[PDB]
């Protein structure tokens, strides 16, 4: 059921957690979020406080240009913010992509 | 990892899929969504078109009064809407609860 439950989260919230892992720094998630404009990023949780890291090296120049025009500039660099701001962070990305 | 990935979806999107099941009608999900105001409901998928069914019989009178004051009235009855409206439906519930 885990695979269809993730499908629901994708249709309901336009977000997909590809996988998780825990390194020395903390617990990390590979995440994509969409609307067709899509953004890929990692969220780290260190113990809590949240680290956001955009995954942009693979994206094409046309792709980067579209995202940059509409998304807030800080979304294209690493960012640290409190856990209590995580849902707003999700909504800001969602509102910017759509 | 499935349990911590669901925890992330909860913190990121303020929603939790308790479980799924498939009956004769289709595929169903028990879902809670929150901000502290919380709403419990089932989403059915019939093949697609979406059926929303609020789960209110257990809630107390004080709880129902708070939700009713702020949430749209149609969220307290069964509702059917196209799959392409599912993310807006999520966002409307999210915006109304917060």
């Amino acid at each position: 059921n885990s695979e269809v439950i993730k499908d629901l989260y994708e249709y309901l919230c336009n977000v997909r957690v590809h996988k998780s892992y825990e390194d020395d720094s903390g617990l990390w998630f590979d995440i994509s979020q969409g609307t067709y404009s899509i953004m890929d990023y990692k969220l780290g949780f260190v113990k809590t406080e949240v680290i956001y890291a955009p995954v942009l090296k693979q994206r094409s120049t046309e792709e980067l240009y579209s995202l940059q025009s509409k998304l807030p500039e800080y979304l294209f660099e690493t960012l640290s913010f409190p856990l209590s701001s995580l849902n707003q962070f999700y909504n800001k990305i969602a509102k910017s992509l759509n | 990892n499935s349990e911590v990935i669901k925890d992330l979806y909860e913190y990121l999107c303020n929603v939790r899929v308790h479980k799924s099941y498939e009956d004769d009608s289709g595929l169903w999900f028990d879902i809670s969504q929150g901000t502290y105001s919380i709403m419990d409901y089932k989403l059915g998928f019939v093949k697609t078109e979406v059926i929303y069914a609020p789960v209110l019989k257990q809630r107390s009178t004080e709880e129902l009064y708070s939700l009713q004051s702020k949430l749209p009235e149609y969220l307290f009855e069964t509702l059917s809407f196209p799959l392409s409206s599912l993310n807006q439906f999520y966002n409307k519930i999210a915006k109304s609860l917060n």
């Binding site: 590809h18 990390w28 899509i38 890929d40 990692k42 | -």
Partner: peptide, 26 residues
């Protein structure tokens, strides 16, 4: 059993997992 169309049939975001191939934590 016969094939049955999935309820969620559109191409998902599962394809994008490959975007994280060579990336490390910051």
């Amino acid at each position: 059993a016969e094939f049955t169309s999935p309820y969620f049939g559109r191409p998902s975001l599962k394809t994008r997992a490959k975007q994280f191939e060579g990336v490390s934590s910051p």
